[PDB]
Structures are given as C-alpha cells and as structure tokens.
Amino acid sequence: VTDSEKVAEYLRRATLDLRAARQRIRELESEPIAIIGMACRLPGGVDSPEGLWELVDSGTDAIAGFPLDRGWDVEGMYDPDAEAPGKTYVKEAGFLYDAGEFDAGFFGISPREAVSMDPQQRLMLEASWEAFERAGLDPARQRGTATGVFVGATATGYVGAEGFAITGNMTAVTSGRISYTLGLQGPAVTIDTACSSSLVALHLACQSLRQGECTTALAGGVTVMPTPTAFTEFSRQRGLAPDGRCKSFAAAADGTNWAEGVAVLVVERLSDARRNGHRVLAVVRGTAINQDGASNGLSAPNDLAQERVIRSALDNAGLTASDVDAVEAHGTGTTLGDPIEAQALLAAYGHERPAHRPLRVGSLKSNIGHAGPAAGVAGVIKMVMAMRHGVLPRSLHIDEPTPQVDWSSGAVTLLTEPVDWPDSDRPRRAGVSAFGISGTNAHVILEQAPTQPAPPVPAAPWLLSAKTPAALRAQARRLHTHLARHPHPDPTDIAHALATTRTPHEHRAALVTDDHGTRGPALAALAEGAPDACLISGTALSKGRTVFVFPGQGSQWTGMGRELLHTSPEFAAYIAECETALNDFVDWSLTDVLRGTEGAPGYDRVDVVQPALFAVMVSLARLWQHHGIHPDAVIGHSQGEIAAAHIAGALSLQDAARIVALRSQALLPLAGLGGMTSLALPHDQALQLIQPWGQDLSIASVNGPHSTVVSGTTHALDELHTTCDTQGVRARRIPVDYASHSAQVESIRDTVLQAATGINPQPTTIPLYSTVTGQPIDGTQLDADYWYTNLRHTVRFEETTRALLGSGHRHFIETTAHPVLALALEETIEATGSDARVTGTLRRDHGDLTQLHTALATAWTHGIDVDWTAVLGDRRTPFELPTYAFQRQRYWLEP
C-alpha cells in the first residue's frame, strides 16, 4: 500500500475520535436537560400542572382569607397600624387549606408519626410520587435507582412517638425521606437559599445529571406556614402589601405577600430521556447562579448582578437575548424591587431584538402571591404549560406599567392581556428568574421539547389497582373523567400505559372487551362499584406458588382452538410442533381435526380425543409460559398426567405423543363395554354404596370432598343409577363409552405395556405431583408400569390437591379449553380454610384472543405477575394518565 492511503486512514481515525471527544465535551459542559415530569400543589385549588394552567389562563386570583383550622387567633391578630408586635395589617394571602391533609397509609406511615411530621415532608412526598407517576415512571420500580433529590426548603417551626418527632422536623430529612420512602440512592440535598432555593436546586440537579452522578433527579421546593410569624414580624417595616396582592410591575406596587405551595420536577438528560422513550415536556437549556455581593443593605437587589446572571444563563444555554420570547420575572411586587428587576430585564434582554417582537414579561406571583422557596420552580411549570399551549397568560393587577422604569425602548412589554405565542421559524423559548432575599440570584432558560407505530392488539386489558377499595373506585372515576375529555384515544396505548407505567397495588380490577362501547360504562360501573359483564375485580395475594392443572376427559368442544390458530401465532406454532410430533403414530392431521375440515374424524371417536386434548392442553400451557406465568408445579388427571409430564420435563414431546396416542388406541376394544358416572358424595359413602355390586364397579376418581366418579360395566352402571335415584343423588353420566380406572383395563394390560415401551424418562425440571401416588414423583419413575397403573388405579386428585395446598401453592390454573375441575378444586379449597384461587384459560364457545386476555387479566387480578410486555408490545405512545387517587386525612398538631 502507498504511504498516502496508509496515513489517510490514520487521519480518518484521528478526526473521527476528535469529533467524538468534542461532542463529549459539548455534552459534559452544557447538555440540554429534559423535564420529563412535573407536579405542583399551589393556592387557589391547584393540585396539578393542568390546574395551574387553568388558574393562570382564566386570570383567577388565588388570594383568600387566612386559615381558621390551624389554631390561629385570626380575629385577634389584625390591626391597621404597621408597628405592633404579634399583629399584621394583611387580611388575605395564598394558602394550602389542605396542607395538613395527607395519605399516611399509602407510604406506610402510622398516624402518630404523621401527626408529628412536618407538613413540608408530607407535601413533598405526595408531590414527588405524583411527579414520578406523571413522568411515565412507576415510582415503585425506581427503588434502588441512582436518582437524586434536590429540594428547596426552610425550617418553618412546625412544632410513644418520641423517635418520630426528631426526624419529622429536621429540614435535612425533607429531601432524605423522599429518597428513603421511594428507596432512591442518588444524593439527597436540602437547599436553603430563601426565594431562590428551589430554582438554585434545579441548577444543582442539572450539574448532578451532567457529571453522570444521577440518571434522574427531583428538583423542587416546598413552602408551608404553620404559624403566622411570617405575617406579624415581617409587617413591621411595611414589607407586605396592604390588600395582600402582589402587584408585579404596576404603578400600584406597594409590597408583596407570602403564599404556601409545593412544586417538583422529575428531570433527566435529554439524550437519556429520548433513549428510554419518555415524554419530554420542556428542555432546560442552561442555568446560572451568582450573588448580589456589595449592595445597599443585605436585603436589597442589585441590577448589575441580575444582568450578570441573565447573561451567564444565556451564555450557558448558548442562546441570544433575542432568542428568548418571554420571561417569568420574579416580580415580588415591592416598590423598590420591581424597578430594579425591570431595569435588569431591559438591559439584559431588551437591548438588541426586532421592535415587533418585544420580550413578554409575566409573573406567577400576581396570581398566587410570593410562593416562597417553591416559587421559582413553580414558575417554570407555568412557563412549561403555556409553552405546551402556545398562549402566554396575562399578569393580574396591572393598571399600567410602573413609571419608575422607562419603557421608552419598547423591547420589553408586560403581559397585560393574553398573547398568542408564535410557533414559527424556531422553538418556543422562555426564561424564569428566582432572585432571592439573601442575594443569590438564579436564572433558568427553557426551550420547547423537540418533535419526536404498531398494530392494535385486540381486547387489550385495561388494568386498575389501588391500596384500598375506595381508592380503587376513585381511580376508576378519575380515569373515566380523564378519558371523557379526550378525542377518541387509542385503547391499546391506554392499556399499555396502565399496565407498564403504574404500580400494581393490592386491590386490583380489570376491563377486557373487544369493542370501545362498553369500556366507558364498565368504568362507570366500577366507579359506583356495581358489577359488569366485562369487569373483573379481586385482591392479589402477596405470597403463593402457581400450579398448572391438567384435567383429563370432559373439556372438549367442537372448534376449540380454532380462533387461536389464526389470531395467535405462538399457539399456531405450538400446535404445529405437536402435529409434527404426533404424525408418527396417528393416521390424521391434528390441524384438520381442530379446524374441523371435511373428512377429519370427530371428537366422538375415543382414539382422537385424547391426542387432541393433549396437544391443545400442552399448547395452552406453553402459551401461558410465553406470557411469563411459569408454573411452580404441575398436576394431572388420568391422561392429563401425560401432558403434565411434558410440561414437567419428564417426557419429551415425541415420547408424550407416543404414549397418549398408543394408549388412546389401546382403549378401542373397551368401547361400548362400560362407562363412567359422576356422583356427588364423599369417598366413604360412594365406596360403601357400590358394595352390593361388589367387584363390578370401582371408584374411578375422587375429584373432591363431595364429588366422585365411578366406572364400570353398563349393566352395573344403569343398575346403580336407579339406586341413586331412589337415594336422591345427582349421578351425572359422563359421555364416554369406556370404563377406564376399573377392572376391564386389565384385559388390555399387555397392550398398554407395549404403548409406553421405548420411552426415555428424565428428571423433572418442574415438580410433578402424581395423582396415583399423591405426592411428588421422580421423573425417572414414569415407566410403562406407571402409565398402566395410572390408567388402572383410582385417581386421588383430592388428596393431591390437599398436599399441594399444604406445600404452599395458592394459584391453580386449568390449561384446558373449558374448566372441568374448577368445581372440585374450589370445593377442596373452601373445605380447607385456604385462600387459594382457581382460574381457567378458555370456555365453551369462547376461544378467541378476547377469552385468553380475560383469563390473563383474571390471573393478574388474583396476583400472578403476568408479563404484560408480551401481550401489549414493548413500547407505544406515552399516553398520559391521572395520578394516584390519594385518600388523604387531616394530621395537624394542636396548639
């Protein structure tokens, strides 16, 4: 090779590595940070970002009278004069009248601990759970994750339970508890920088994301006033407005006013959020923080510092002054603060931009007052929601722009009335300021989220769950109301969101239907709790092992599995595998028999029903396994044992097919000689009832404590039928023509010994409970004589089920085309004082995917960890759902 190409390839490698390193520098210095979730509780009845948007868009003022349930002597702590201890001239301010409300039971906190718990901690816990739920993340599954918690808070002096009172009031716990209750492992830091506390925390969170120390972070703040000390002492210097309205950037600006609140953001790196398919609401592009430093007093703003922090944030974001369309100004409403902020905004933003695109300035504090530490983060939530709706809400209580600052430049304009946000030529961008009393300024730059199918599964289950039945009903009602105000959402997306992005709680319910006309009424019926055809309900079991039951004769009907052959590809593949394994010693194709094509034998013939039942049952069991329901044991019933053996790993598919086919063929000479009859009596009564007939009859099977099957000759059978009629016993006759589990099978003994010859048993991967023995059986013992005994000796299904219940098995699943042993299993369970639950796969005339999904939903409702990823696909559109319906109760310390 020439040296030119030899060095050219090295140059290519070097420049590619250089590009990679430069991109890494770019993403390590200033990467965009996606706000994948938000949550907030603010005055004016706000409890979600949508509530905040409704409040600001309507121009509603959340200022209201003082709380009366907090022990405040509100009548005796108001006088007009501005100089008096313990008295204030402010009548109204923002408040969270449900601040003491908290769902203690949800987080495992006892009532006595909750009473001695700071309201800030409770509000932060609830808001963090809501934020995680709104981000498409299951909060329970975040346990053990490297998730940080940066929270802005202050010590507000809220104050058998001696231990709880210590950790229940320390501000350091205000973040730590969030990472303890949820089990997060990233750093938990409680910032305290006055009004800038929350926004500053968000900046720190961004750093924690950029260094790789966190994969996700909670950035937020909380503000609660258990006592009126913020109103009495601060009013000495006429700091608060007289009427209590924060007139932001208005000539009537004559003070500020405090307000409670909480606001959190679940934030992740934009690349990581895109990789995980999370919904990105907005993008923090850059942030900056500094200090006023030298200023006219400690508590006084400095315009130069605000200009510096705004410019630093713009440089960090890599955006120009003209690139920002609007700003959420701090806007405290003070006479001295507002002109300083206006001058800073005019100098920094409104200096070089088109005259026809002035910077729109607003302030959330005009609506809800000065929210305190939680203000700044709450601000971005407003600037997110408007950014989603493309409408800039108006700022209230602005009779005219204040004359202290000069608006002659015209580059900056207040939001006197709502202004439509253009969505052309560039993404929408905005800014938020959180200038603090202590002097720490903070500015954040937000950018619009960047612009980002599978076939619809039929009869997608809609899953709901809650801690208590009342919470479940509240969840159903909330979901119904949310879906009502939605233009025909995709049902499969809703199913996927409910199944994957929500925690499975104890009390569960499901809705399975193939048409979008019953889901609404079904949700309503769940809401008021009335029953419905497509509604399923239950209480999941915390512990319990699963069992697959394999009944023998009885669960057959024409067309069974016909629909699954078309709809379900996995079932078709398993049926094809069984067909290939069964073709060797059978003179017909299984697929023709199942599909009922012309010329194929019917199910009346004995030699074909057991192979077909075996294949269908094995395919259904493997389909259950494909959905993640791996059995912890198996149990058979006469021929079903063979199928169970194949699921136990004892027998290969070829061996099981050989055994079942040849054993069914060997039963042909028995046709017409006798039959079976099922009667409802205990074992002893049935046994002594057949004594007059002696050896002619025998106990074919003991299904349950009051259900047995007796097999024998037709003459003996219909002689005993009239005796049972005399005694009044519902001796139901099984439609069969062969008296197995009786003496007649001896006549064919050698043949069945030839039927099972040549097989190669192996040890069982899954335990197998043999009905013949009544206990677990070694896989290598399933020789020919074992199968002959299974055909000959009486079945002891009841004793085997009792042993299974004793061993700690709680979920019984019948893999048949129709349940036949559900009654016996339920009778055994209720006669033992065990909380086991029985389910079936299909039913008569119901074998489509709808019935399979109904069975899966019922199994999940009973508490089986069904893998819904296989059923509903791997990933779909991130449909948004309402958060958990907390059942709050009031906890507050008396004076």
């Binding site: 009845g45 349930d69 009248y97 809401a527």
Partner: protein, 49 residues
C-alpha cells in the same frame, strides 16, 4: 364574654368533585330565561355526566 359568638366564613380546600350520576332537574325563573347563570350551570351538569 363566655356567651359571645360570631358567624364567619371559613375558607376550605376545593373539593375534587365527582360524576353527576343520573338526571338532574334544574328549575329556572322565566324572567331570567336563557341568560347568564342558567345556561352555564346546565352546560356544567351536562359535562358532569
């Protein structure tokens, strides 16, 4: 002073609400006709279920 009292209006948290089940009978004066409050409350109960 033990027997002194006063009526007042405690602020309270806004209730989340629920679905308006069944049929609701709204009765309005004929003088008002379809003006302000009647049409809007009728619409509100209509969207309430």
């Amino acid at each position: 002073d033990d027997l002194r009292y006063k009526v007042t209006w405690k602020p309270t948290a806004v209730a989340d609400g629920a679905s308006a089940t069944g049929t609701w009978l709204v009765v309005v004066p004929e003088s008002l006709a379809g003006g302000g409050w009647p049409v809007v409350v009728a619409r509100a109960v209509d969207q309430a279920g």
